[PDB]
């Protein structure tokens, strides 16, 4: 109810705690015309599912700074050449950056 | 300098871990509404009244 995104009816609450989801909340049944059928999510016998924490989805500042240096070097090399070749840049070239 | 963070992967993994559209909608009253499929829907965040 909490960590479901906003348009799916939830609140889209971000988390940074070890929140375990019991395997009784990953089961859903649908009634086809032939008969009711049931489903789980961890369909192979595995560990308990865990809410992803924001901690693993933000790049460290060190990597961001070194990548900023490298990427701006790439952009400078990709722009000074464009001066000689006489064309404006485009999304195609800079999508990788 | 643009937003310095991305949450598309985070929401992707949250949907994946929560059981997807059917794994979350089983908890909801969606099946009671009886829509043939969950596509082609919008949320009225504000009633006209």
């Amino acid at each position: 109810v909490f960590y479901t995104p906003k348009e799916l009816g939830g609140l889209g609450m971000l988390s940074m705690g070890h929140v375990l989801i019991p395997q009784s909340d990953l089961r859903w049944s649908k009634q086809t015309d032939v008969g009711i059928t049931h489903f789980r999510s961890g369909m192979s016998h595995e560990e308990d599912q865990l809410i992803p924490n924001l901690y693993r989805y933000i790049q460290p500042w060190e990597s961001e700074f070194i990548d900023s240096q490298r990427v701006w070097a790439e952009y400078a090399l990709k722009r000074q050449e464009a001066i000689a070749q006489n064309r404006r840049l485009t999304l195609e070239d800079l999508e990788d950056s | 300098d643009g937003k310095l963070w991305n949450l598309n992967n985070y929401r992707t993994d949250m949907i994946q871990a929560l059981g997807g559209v059917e794994g979350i909608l089983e908890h909801t009253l969606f099946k009671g509404t009886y829509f043939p499929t969950w596509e082609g829907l919008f949320w009225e965040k504000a009633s006209g009244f």
């Binding site: 909490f2 988390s15 940074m16 705690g17 070890h18 929140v19 375990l20 019991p22 992803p52 924490n53 901690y55 693993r56 989805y57 933000i58 790049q59 460290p60 990597s63 | 991305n6 992967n9 985070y10 993994d13």
Partner: peptide
């Protein structure tokens, strides 16, 4: 099982910030 949030202190042995976010 409970909905209470568990502190991830001591839960960071095998994880990194940039992992699973490329």
């Amino acid at each position: 099982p409970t909905g209470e949030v568990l502190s991830l202190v001591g839960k960071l042995e095998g994880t990194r910030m940039g992992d699973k976010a490329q």
